[PDB]
Design a protein around this ligand. Structure first.
Ligand SMILES: CC(C)CCC[C@@H](C)[C@H]1CC[C@H]2[C@@H]3CC=C4C[C@@H](O)CC[C@]4(C)[C@H]3CC[C@]12C
Ligand SMILES: CC(C)CCC[C@@H](C)[C@H]1CC[C@H]2[C@@H]3CC=C4C[C@@H](O)CC[C@]4(C)[C@H]3CC[C@]12C
Ligand SMILES: CC(C)CCC[C@@H](C)[C@H]1CC[C@H]2[C@@H]3CC=C4C[C@@H](O)CC[C@]4(C)[C@H]3CC[C@]12C
Ligand SMILES: CCCCC#Cc1nc(N)c2nc(-c3cccs3)n([C@@H]3OC[C@@H](O)[C@H]3O)c2n1
Ligand SMILES: CCCCCCCC/C=C\CCCCCCCC(=O)OC[C@H](O)CO
Ligand SMILES: CCCCCCCC/C=C\CCCCCCCC(=O)OC[C@H](O)CO
Ligand SMILES: CCCCCCCC/C=C\CCCCCCCC(=O)OC[C@H](O)CO
Ligand SMILES: CCCCCCCC/C=C\CCCCCCCC(=O)OC[C@H](O)CO
Ligand SMILES: CCCCCCCC/C=C\CCCCCCCC(=O)OC[C@H](O)CO
Ligand SMILES: CCCCCCCC/C=C\CCCCCCCC(=O)O
Ligand SMILES: CCCCCCCC/C=C\CCCCCCCC(=O)O
Ligand SMILES: CCCCCCCC/C=C\CCCCCCCC(=O)O
Ligand SMILES: CCCCCCCC/C=C\CCCCCCCC(=O)O
Ligand SMILES: CCCCCCCC/C=C\CCCCCCCC(=O)O
Ligand SMILES: CCCCCCCC/C=C\CCCCCCCC(=O)O
Ligand SMILES: CCCCCCCC/C=C\CCCCCCCC(=O)O
Ligand SMILES: CCCCCCCC/C=C\CCCCCCCC(=O)O
Ligand SMILES: CCCCCCCC/C=C\CCCCCCCC(=O)O
Ligand SMILES: CCCCCCCC/C=C\CCCCCCCC(=O)O
Ligand SMILES: CCCCCCCC/C=C\CCCCCCCC(=O)O
Ligand SMILES: CCCCCCCC/C=C\CCCCCCCC(=O)O
Ligand SMILES: CCCCCCCC/C=C\CCCCCCCC(=O)O
Ligand SMILES: CCCCCCCC/C=C\CCCCCCCC(=O)O
Ligand SMILES: CCCCCCCC/C=C\CCCCCCCC(=O)O
Ligand SMILES: CCCCCCCC/C=C\CCCCCCCC(=O)O
Ligand SMILES: CCCCCCCC/C=C\CCCCCCCC(=O)O
Ligand SMILES: CCCCCCCC/C=C\CCCCCCCC(=O)O
Ligand SMILES: CCCCCCCC/C=C\CCCCCCCC(=O)O
Ligand SMILES: CCCCCCCC/C=C\CCCCCCCC(=O)O
Ligand code: NA
Length: 396
């Protein structure tokens, strides 16, 4: 006994865990309360947010008390010890599924918006959420099915602590096999899905980049070909430019504001047709004058359509970044503990990470259950405004 009494360091760890638990419950209860109250927040994307918040509420209510209990090494039946050690794996896996669903949902919205509402529905989302929770319990509790160290209990540690028959000193790394934690949980169930999310978000931002560039190209094609018509010398040159503009207009043609965008393209294709007939009749001056009327349609309809399409794309990029930040923070908070397990497993010649670092890595992982409500409040106005209403009306 040359080191400080364990209860002193335990007290700091336990106090910090309890602080994290309270904060995890408060913030994520607020998220669930906001979606339940505000119909503007009731969409498929946010149903996975609620599932994610539910997992974080359970981290504070169950996983953290379990972790505190594990840190004492109390005597326990091995499979009972195994359950409280593995339950957080269930919650982490649920978080992964929810995060992956959110990325996929945002990809469907950007890649095929015209058939998003018919493909992604609330009833289908609720069923997916239920399946993912079942799979999370199956994956997280796999050690309960026999992939555990309960067959080889550390009897020396058990006897030294005065444990009874069939009991062990309940310690995470004594009951949960490290090949499970590294190969099965980390590589297969955590790292691979996180890498898939990375690929999905790369496809989301690439798709958004491509669609914003295409919009700016059509706007340039319309204006360039208008100049070609104005400076044309014969009717054939006017026809060639008008033939291009017509195909582009019909290509760009694929609520009150929407009622005026449909009326705008009807004027545009009609005005292109009028000029195209004049050009085919060899009336070059009549065609140019008719083409000049397109500027009026451009100023009153086409330019406004371009700006709303651009605004909508930029809002999707902003939302996709918010979702990517959530997934990235999950990786940042959990990777240290995973990396420590890799050193324990792959470097038997390395000294085990010290107890204080284990505490720090565990606290960091649990802090992930606190951060999501802040991301929503800082990056999503509808959440921010709803949070204020709830706070001003019920807390204050
Ligand atoms: C739905 C929620 C509220 C129910 C919570 C039930 C939890 C707390 C229960 C369910 C199973 C229980 C465990 C089952 C078996 C054992 C083995 C025993 O030697 C020590 C206690 C221990 C480890 C129990 C601790 C408490 C426990 C984890
Ligand atoms: C960006 C984030 C996710 C990376 C964090 C990496 C952390 C977890 C890495 C960086 C350096 C690593 C340490 C480097 C050296 C040792 C000494 C060895 O005897 C036990 C493991 C231990 C103590 C490692 C534990 C994990 C460690 C602390
Ligand atoms: C893309 C990133 C975030 C994925 C994480 C990569 C992980 C798996 C990498 C990063 C650092 C790596 C460790 C670096 C050093 C050692 C010490 C060596 O004696 C055994 C392997 C071990 C323990 C490596 C295992 C794998 C490792 C933990
Ligand atoms: C020594 C500190 C107190 C006793 C302990 C431990 C301990 N040792 C580990 N090697 C470990 N690895 C994990 C992982 C679960 C999912 C991914 S990594 N955990 C659990 O993850 C956060 C907490 O819930 C904790 O119980 C771990 N706990
Ligand atoms: C957003 C990412 C997370 C941001 C938040 C930072 C993450 C850490 C959390 C709280 C401070 C850490 C408190 C440290 C408590 C663990 C150390 C401990 O228990 O001390 C052991 C003792 O000193 C000898 O055993
Ligand atoms: C949401 C409302 C708040 C409810 C939550 C607040 C009430 C719980 C308070 C304290 C629990 C303290 C946990 C006791 C665990 C002590 C373990 C200990 O000290 O022993 C360590 C071991 O013996 C050597 O490593
Ligand atoms: C809001 C409250 C609603 C919450 C919903 C509650 C529904 C729980 C249903 C079944 C739990 C079955 C118990 C599972 C935990 C026990 C694990 C177990 O039995 O293993 C320990 C073993 O006995 C060691 O010897
Ligand atoms: C939406 C809610 C979803 C929840 C749906 C639940 C799905 C559970 C599926 C697989 C886990 C089964 C793991 C096996 C549990 C075994 C516990 C047990 O009894 O083993 C200890 C033994 O009794 C002492 O030797
Ligand atoms: C940043 C917060 C990191 C501080 C976490 C506590 C560091 C700590 O406990 O110090 C290790 C010391 O050597 C224990 O013996
Ligand atoms: C803040 C949470 C309050 C922590 C008080 C309990 C300290 C842990 C202990 O009793 O050992
Ligand atoms: C984590 C920080 C969030 C703090 C939320 C404070 C208002 C409480 C509202 C509530 O949970 O009912
Ligand atoms: C578990 C208890 C905490 C969950 C409470 C969440 C309530 C908020 C919205 C649902 C109504
Ligand atoms: C014992 C297995 C059966 C358990 C029943 C399922 C568990 C229920 C868990 C949480 C209930 C909250 C579900 C979300 C409510 C949303 C309300 C709505 O759809 O409008
Ligand atoms: C752990 C327990 C936490 C889980 C409880 C949260 C359940 C529901 C929160 C509110 C979700 C909003 C559902 C809206 C459905 C709809 O709009 O039809
Ligand atoms: C509202 C949901 C409430 C859930 C309660 C969870 C809090 C309890 C957490 C862990 C239980 C600790 C079990 C410790 C067993 C010690 C018995 C012994 O000394 O052998
Ligand atoms: C909603 C909160 C859920 C209830 C949690 C209550 C807070 C208790 C926190 C940790 C419990 C730890 C109990 C000690 C484990 C057994 C240690 C021993 O046997 O010596
Ligand atoms: C509400 C949930 C229950 C909250 C507090 C209950 C008191 C917890 C006391 C833990 C004592 C554990 C121990 O004796 O080691
Ligand atoms: C034990 C684990 C319990 C997990 C609880 C799961 C509840 C979390 C999120 C439920 C989301 C409910 C959304 C309902 C939308 C359905 C609809 O739009 O019609
Ligand atoms: C219903 C939600 C709780 C189900 C958890 C029980 C399943 C496996 C543990 C034994
Ligand atoms: C999932 C469906 C079935 C798996 C349930 C198996 C129960 C595990 C028994 C634990 C044991 O006694 O070793
Ligand atoms: C994607 C994440 C997984 C990627 C590659 C799997 C790594 C395979 C591990 C080889 C183990 C080496 C050994 O036998 O010690
Ligand atoms: C056995 C381990 C189960 C693997 C769980 C990891 C989930 C990975 C991919 C799920 C489907 C991805 C769809 C894109
Ligand atoms: C481990 C890989 C890191 C996973 C990060 C997940 C999503 C970030 C997307 C960034 C584009
Ligand atoms: C292994 C590390 C890389 C993981 C995932 C990236 C997959 C490649 C992304 C596809 C991008 C295609 C596109 O931008 O159109
Ligand atoms: C490993 C992950 C490291 C940092 C995660 C930060 C958030 C990643 C999403 C980028 C958003 C653009
Ligand atoms: C990102 C993808 C993750 C890649 C994971 C790397 C795979 C294996 C790293 C660990 C291999 C170390 C085994 C060394 C065994 C020995 O010391 O002889
Ligand atoms: C913030 C401070 C973080 C310091 C600890 C976390 C990560 C860096 C790892 C430092 C190495 C300490 C363990 C190595 C050893 O003592 O043998
Ligand atoms: C990418 C910016 C943050 C840099 C890494 C921070 C996360 C790792 C912090 C501590 C790991 C040791 C516990
Ligand atoms: C011991 C208690 C530990 C508390 C952990 C810290 C909690 C802070 C929560 C979230 C931090 C991130 C909030 C800022 C996100 C801004 C989003 C953005 O604008 O890009
Ligand atoms: Na989580």
């Amino acid at each position: 006994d040359d080191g400080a009494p364990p209860i002193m360091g335990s007290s700091v760890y336990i106090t910090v865990e309890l602080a994290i638990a309270v904060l995890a419950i408060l913030g994520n209860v607020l998220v669930c309360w906001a979606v339940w109250l505000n119909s503007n927040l009731q969409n498929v994307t946010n149903y996975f947010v609620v599932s994610l918040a539910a997992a974080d509420i359970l981290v504070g209510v169950l996983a953290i008390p379990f972790a505190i209990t594990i840190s004492t090494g109390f005597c326990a039946a091995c499979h009972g010890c195994l359950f409280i050690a593995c339950f957080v794996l269930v919650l982490a896996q649920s978080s992964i599924f929810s995060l992956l669903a959110i990325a996929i949902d945002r990809y469907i919205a950007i890649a095929i918006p015209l058939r998003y509402n018919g493909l992604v529905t609330g009833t289908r989302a609720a069923g997916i959420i239920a399946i993912c929770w079942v799979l999370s319990f199956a994956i997280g509790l796999t050690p309960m099915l026999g992939w555990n160290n309960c067959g080889q209990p550390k009897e020396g540690k058990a006897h030294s602590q005065g444990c009874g028959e069939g009991q062990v000193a309940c310690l995470f790394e004594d009951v949960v096999p490290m090949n499970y934690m590294v190969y099965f949980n980390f590589f297969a169930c955590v790292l691979v899905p996180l890498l898939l999310m990375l690929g999905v978000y790369l496809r989301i931002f690439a798709a958004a980049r491509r669609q914003l560039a295409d919009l700016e190209d059509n706007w340039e094609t319309l204006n360039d070909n208008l100049k070609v018509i104005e400076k044309a010398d014969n009717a054939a040159q006017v026809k060639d430019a008008l033939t291009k503009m017509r195909a582009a207009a019909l290509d760009a043609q694929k609520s009150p504001e929407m009622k005026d965008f449909r009326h705008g393209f009807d004027i545009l294709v009609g005005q292109i047709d009028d000029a195209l007939k004049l050009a085919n009749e060899g009336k070059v001056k009549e065609a140019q004058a008719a083409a000049e009327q397109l500027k009026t349609t451009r100023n009153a309809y086409i330019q406004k359509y371009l700006e709303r399409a651009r605004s909508t794309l930029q809002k999707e990029v902003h939302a996709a970044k918010s979702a990517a930040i959530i997934a990235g923070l999950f990786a940042l908070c959990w990777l240290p503990l995973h990396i420590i397990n890799c050193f324990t497993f792959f470097c038997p010649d390395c000294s085990h990470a010290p107890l204080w670092l284990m505490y720090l890595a565990i606290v960091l992982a649990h802090t992930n259950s606190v951060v999501n409500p802040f991301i929503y409040a800082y990056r999503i106005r509808e959440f921010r405004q709803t949070f204020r209403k709830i706070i001003r009306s019920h807390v204050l």
